[PDB]
Every structure is written in C-alpha cells, then in structure tokens.
Amino acid sequence: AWKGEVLANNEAGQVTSIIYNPGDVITIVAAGWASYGPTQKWGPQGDREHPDQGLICHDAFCGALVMKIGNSGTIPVNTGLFRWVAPNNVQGAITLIYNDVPGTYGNNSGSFSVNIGKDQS
Amino acid sequence: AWKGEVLANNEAGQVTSIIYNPGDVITIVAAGWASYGPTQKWGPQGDREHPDQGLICHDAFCGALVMKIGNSGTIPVNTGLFRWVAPNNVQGAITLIYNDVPGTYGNNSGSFSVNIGKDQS
Amino acid sequence: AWKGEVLANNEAGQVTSIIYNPGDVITIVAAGWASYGPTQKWGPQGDREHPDQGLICHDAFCGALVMKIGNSGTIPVNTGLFRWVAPNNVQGAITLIYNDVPGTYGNNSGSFSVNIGKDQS
Amino acid sequence: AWKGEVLANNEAGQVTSIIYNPGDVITIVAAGWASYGPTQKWGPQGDREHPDQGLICHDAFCGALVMKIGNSGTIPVNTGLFRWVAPNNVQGAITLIYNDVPGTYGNNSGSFSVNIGKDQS
Numbered sequence: 001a002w003k004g005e006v007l008a009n010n011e012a013g014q015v016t017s018i019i020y021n022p023g024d025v026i027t028i029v030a031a032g033w034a035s036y037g038p039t040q041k042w043g044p045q046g047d048r049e050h051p052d053q054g055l056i057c058h059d060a061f062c063g064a065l066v067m068k069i070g071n072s073g074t075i076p077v078n079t080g081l082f083r084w085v086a087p088n089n090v091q092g093a094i095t096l097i098y099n100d101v102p103g104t105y106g107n108n109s110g111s112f113s114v115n116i117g118k119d120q121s
Numbered sequence: 122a123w124k125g126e127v128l129a130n131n132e133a134g135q136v137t138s139i140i141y142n143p144g145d146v147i148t149i150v151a152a153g154w155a156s157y158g159p160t161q162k163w164g165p166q167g168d169r170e171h172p173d174q175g176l177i178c179h180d181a182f183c184g185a186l187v188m189k190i191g192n193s194g195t196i197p198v199n200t201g202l203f204r205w206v207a208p209n210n211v212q213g214a215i216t217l218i219y220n221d222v223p224g225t226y227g228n229n230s231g232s233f234s235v236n237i238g239k240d241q242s
Numbered sequence: 243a244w245k246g247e248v249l250a251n252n253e254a255g256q257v258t259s260i261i262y263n264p265g266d267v268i269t270i271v272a273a274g275w276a277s278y279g280p281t282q283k284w285g286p287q288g289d290r291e292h293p294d295q296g297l298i299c300h301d302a303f304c305g306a307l308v309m310k311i312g313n314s315g316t317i318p319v320n321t322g323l324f325r326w327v328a329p330n331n332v333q334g335a336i337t338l339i340y341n342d343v344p345g346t347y348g349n350n351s352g353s354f355s356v357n358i359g360k361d362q363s
Numbered sequence: 364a365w366k367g368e369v370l371a372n373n374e375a376g377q378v379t380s381i382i383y384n385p386g387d388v389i390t391i392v393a394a395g396w397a398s399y400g401p402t403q404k405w406g407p408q409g410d411r412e413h414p415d416q417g418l419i420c421h422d423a424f425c426g427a428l429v430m431k432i433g434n435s436g437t438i439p440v441n442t443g444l445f446r447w448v449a450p451n452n453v454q455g456a457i458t459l460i461y462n463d464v465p466g467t468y469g470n471n472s473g474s475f476s477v478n479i480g481k482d483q484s
C-alpha cells in the first residue's frame with residue numbers, strides 16, 4: 001500500500017509507488033483541505049460552485065483529486081475509489097494530481113492525505 | 122460489502138448490513154453533497170468554518186459523516202476509513218449518520234453515497 | 243446632521259441626534275462590515291443567503307442596517323435612504339439597529355459607519 | 364439630481380446627468396446586488412475576500428461601485444458618499460462603473476440602483 005500527501009500547488013502531481021497492472025483492484029481514500037487560489041479551502045471533491053476554466057480533468061470539479069495511471073488521461077478520484085478496476089487498457093505508476101487549470105498552480109494552498117492499496121482479486 | 126445512501130435529514134442514521142466484529146478490518150469510502158440547513162452543500166468532511174453548536178460528534182465538523190458501531194458513541198468517518206480496526210471494545214451493526222445538532226435534522230438536504238467492506242485480516 | 247458608528251453587537255441600537263419631525267426629508271449613507279456570528283462579514287444589506295430565524299426586521303436580511311423612529315416598528319435602511327420621508331404619524335429620535343435575532347447579539351462583531359442629514363424641504 | 368441603474372456588465376460605465384463643478388457638494392446612495400462572474404452576488408462594497416487581479420480601481424474591492432468625474436481616475440463610491448467634495452482640478456460629468464478587470468465584464472450580472480444629488484453649499 002502507499003500513504004502520502006499530494007500538494008495542491010504540485011502541477012506535475014505526486015508519483016506513488018503503486019503500479020496499476022491489468023486486473024488489479026484498488027481502493028483509494030483521500031482526505032484534507034486545499035484551495036486553487038481563494039482563501040477558502042475545499043475537500044477532495046473540490047468546489048461544486050466554480051466553473052471549469054480549462055481544468056486538467058473535465059469530469060471533476062476544480063480542486064478535486066484526480067489521477068493518472070502511466071501515460072493515461074486524467075481519471076477522477078475525489079474522496080476515493082472503492083475496489084476499483086480500470087475500465088480501459090491503462091497500466092503504470094499512479095500519479096495523484098490536484099485538479100486545476102494548467103499554469104495556475106502557483107497560488108494553490110494545502111494538500112490531501114491519500115491512502116492507496118491493492119485489494120484481493 | 123454494503124453500498125447505500127445516508128440522507129442528511131435522517132436523525133436516527135442509516136443502518137447497514139455490516140456487523141463490525143473483533144479484529145475486523147474495514148474500508149469505507151463516502152462521497153456526495155449535503156447540507157445541515159444552508160442552501161450551500163458540503164462533502165463528507167462537512168463545513169470547516171461552522172462552529173460546533175452541540176453536534177452528535179465533537180471530533181468532526183457539522184455536516185461530516187460519522188458512524189456508530191452497535192451501542193457505541195459516534196466515530197468520525199469523513200471521506201472514509203482505510204483498512205481501519207476499531208481501537209476499543211466496539212461491536213455490532215454499523216449505522217452511518219450525518220453530523221448535526223440533535224433535533225435540527227428536519228431542514229437538512231442531500232445525502233452521501235457510502236461503500237463499506239471488510240478487508241483481509 | 244449626525245455621524246457615528248452602529249455596533250453589530252448593540253441589541254438596543256445606536257441612538258442618533260436626529261429627531262424626525264413631520265415633513266422632514268432625510269438622507270442616510272451607511273458603510274462597513276459586520277457579522278451576526280459567522281466568520282464572514284457582510285455590508286449594510288446583510289446576508290441575502292441566510293433565512294429569517296426571528297429577525298427584528300422581517301423586511302431586510304439578517305445583518306442589514308435598520309432603524310426605528312420614536313414609536314415605530316423597524317424600517318429597513320440597508321446602504322441608506324435618499325431624500326426620504328417617513329410614513330404618516332412616524333416621528334421622534336432615530337435609533338439605528340443591526341438586524342438580528344433577539345438574544346443572539348453577543349456573538350456579533352464589526353460595525354457600520356452611518357451619516358444622517360436633513361434635506362431641504 | 365440623478366437616479367438610475369448601473370449594470371455590472373457595462374464596462375464603459377453609466378453616464379449620469381450630474382456635472383461636478385468646482386465647490387459642489389454631492390451625496391450618492393447606492394444599493395443592490397451584482398456579480399463579477401461567480402454564482403454569489405455582492406452589494407456595492409463588492410467582495411472583500413477576492414484579490415485584485417487587475418481592477419479598474421485598486422482602492423475598492425472587486426464588484427464595488429466606483430466613479431469617474433470628467434478626466435479623473437477611478438474614485439471609490441461603495442455604498443455612497445455623504446456631502447462629499449472632489450479633489451482639486453476634478454470636474455465634469457460623473458460616470459458610475461462596476462469595479463472589475465477590463466475585458467471580463469461579459470460574465471457579470473445584476474446592477475446597482477444609484478441616486479446622486481447636489482447638496483447646499
């Protein structure tokens with residue numbers, strides 16, 4: 001399993017030691033408080049009131065937790081994924097990323113604490 | 122495993138089919154949007170800005186997800202618990218409850234979607 | 243003319259030196275930031291999102307500026323009134339009041355700066 | 364005297380019938396709700412939580428009411444000005460403007476109701 005922190009201001013994302021392989025079932029739990037710039041903070045589902053101004057992930061709110069698996073596009077994580085299997089041919093290290101507009105990560109604040117494990121399969 | 126919804130306006134809480142026994146390891150993932158009265162909604166960590174005016178759980182914000190195990194006191198869940206073991210002698214059905222002040226659940230709105238499973242042990 | 247400060251925690255209200263007499267025309271300008279309890283602050287129009295939970299003035303938002311003129315009920319002031327005449331039979335000293343629920347003024351803070359003058363008539 | 368509406372999406376501003384002449388004393392009262400983009404609305408003091416990202420007036424919040432008088436730079440109005448005199452060499456038609464970032468007025472909404480009069484002098 002992996003446990004660690006993902007900073008909201010980390011545009012490249014936080015690489016984990018989890019390599020997602022074909023058939024793996026994973027569970028992710030995310031917690032904490034972060035901002036994409038405002039003095040307010042939001043949890044891992046982000047800000048449901050804020051429009052999408054060009055986010056790295058269009059299927060999650062600004063300020064949500066998302067991930068990439070190897071060379072994949074972004075995949076929503078939000079609060080977490082329960083005994084999840086990847087629906088397509090994605091493989092490789094999981095990187096956790098804060099959902100914001102590229103180039104705008106420098107004013108971000110806070111972090112999420114994340115746990116990832118592989119479940120029985 | 123159990124998957125279901127917990128309404129924010131449900132003062133008694135949502136009973137699950139998970140019976141927590143000694144030594145069990147459980148994982149919980151919670152998602153969604155709810156309110157303790159305001160037109161705004163918050164995720165399963167609740168409203169970090171709102172004071173505790175007498176909540177059922179003093180160790181989580183107003184609007185957070187909490188639980189009881191059998192006859193226990195409230196236990197914070199928030200976004201979830203990863204491969205969690207109960208630290209004391211608690212046993213029995215898990216009930217999920219929205220964290221609000223007793224008697225004030227009638228103006229609540231929304232719900233959380235929750236998954237609970239027992240992990241390998 | 244009168245200028246002074248209306249404290250949000252002043253339940254009885256701020257008496258002014260203005261005695262409203264029949265036929266008088268008055269102008270009020272109010273400015274500043276105050277709270278009825280929450281960490282946020284609002285201007286003299288108060289909080290348009292907050293329901294009326296027993297306000298002293300049901301025709302203005304919580305945290306708005308209101309007034310009484312001698313024997314009157316509360317009258318909304320908000321940001322002010324321009325060359326305003328009172329209703330029939332309304333006369334006497336103007337008192338300015340923060341619009342909130344009686345008995346809850348103890349957790350209020352901030353204040354409004356207010357000017358009142360009598361206009362030509 | 365002048366009364367009218369200042370649209371938040373009106374980048375050039377709302378011209379008034381008031382010509383500010385040397386030695387004039389004026390009173391302005393402004394009221395209402397507007398937005399510079401977000402779902403929320405703010406009064407004529409604007410949004411005290413939002414940083415200045417290139418406002419036309421750096422001495423008022425985003426979403427505040429401001430003015431120009433003939434050749435002047437922007438001057439804060441907020442909720443209004445009581446028996447106010449202009450700085451040296453400031454004269455001409457008063458234009459009222461919603462304080463926002465140039466080129467972003469297209470996603471604004473709402474308006475302020477404004478009265479201006481000349482006072483005795």
Ligand SMILES: C=C(c1ccc(OC)cc1)c1ccc(S[C@@H]2O[C@H](CO)[C@H](O)[C@H](O)[C@H]2O)cc1
Nearest residue numbers: 157158172174221222225228278279280281349
């Ligand atoms: C004036 C304040 C307030 C806020 C903060 C304060 O101290 C920081 C003091 C007073 C205020 C405003 C709105 C609500 S909603 C309010 O929340 C309650 C729990 O706390 C109940 O769920 C109730 O059903 C709900 O309507 C509750 C309190």
Ligand SMILES: C=C(c1ccc(OC)cc1)c1ccc(S[C@@H]2O[C@H](CO)[C@H](O)[C@H](O)[C@H]2O)cc1
Nearest residue numbers: 036037051053100101104107399400401402470
């Ligand atoms: C005027 C509006 C706005 C809001 C809603 C709108 O449509 C509903 C239009 C404009 C506004 C206000 C604050 C921010 S913070 C803003 O968010 C960005 C992502 O969207 C970046 O993370 C940036 O670093 C941050 O400062 C962004 C936009």
Ligand SMILES: [Ca+2]
Nearest residue numbers: 036037104105
């Ligand atoms: Ca940002």
Ligand SMILES: [Ca+2]
Nearest residue numbers: 157158225226
């Ligand atoms: Ca409630």
Ligand SMILES: [Ca+2]
Nearest residue numbers: 278279346347
């Ligand atoms: Ca109060």
Ligand SMILES: [Ca+2]
Nearest residue numbers: 399400467468
């Ligand atoms: Ca704008």
